[PDB]
Amino acid sequence: GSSGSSGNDDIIVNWVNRTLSEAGKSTSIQSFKDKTISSSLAVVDLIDAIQPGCINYDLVKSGNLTEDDKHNNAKYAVSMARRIGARVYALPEDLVEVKPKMVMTVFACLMGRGMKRVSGPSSG
């Protein structure tokens, strides 16, 4: 157990999973360096949770995504993310390479719109 909330890197990740479940998705990540973000499968399944009805899987690929596919998948996620207005101007390329430089915020920005507030029992 590590005290003091520094970096705030895991927090984001933890949420991503929570959101995906809130709707019931079969996709999830572990970190911004994960080799799963290159498929842009967890990114799309996320947006939906927040603003459903807009995400169309019919177009979104799945499974063995070739160099060309991977890019295509991401491209879609990007448009949406920005479509719903997530103050995110990241490129669809950073996702393919899974760069922790932009892939870190791309996940955070989304959270913003989502979780608005949270309050629990002071005592007991």
Curated annotation (Swiss-Prot):
Domain of life: Eukaryota
Compartment(s): Cytoplasm
Residues covered by the Calponin-homology (CH) domain: 8-115
Tissue-wise expression: Expressed in a variety of organs, including muscle, brain, uterus and esophagus.
Assembly information from the UniProt record: Monomer.
Disease named in the record: Osteoporosis: A systemic skeletal disorder characterized by decreased bone mass and deterioration of bone microarchitecture without alteration in the composition of bone. The result is fragile bones and an increased risk of fractures, even after minimal trauma. Osteoporosis is a chronic condition of multifactorial etiology and is usually clinically silent until a fracture occurs.
Function, as annotated: Actin-bundling protein.
Protein name, per record: Plastin-3
Organism: Homo sapiens
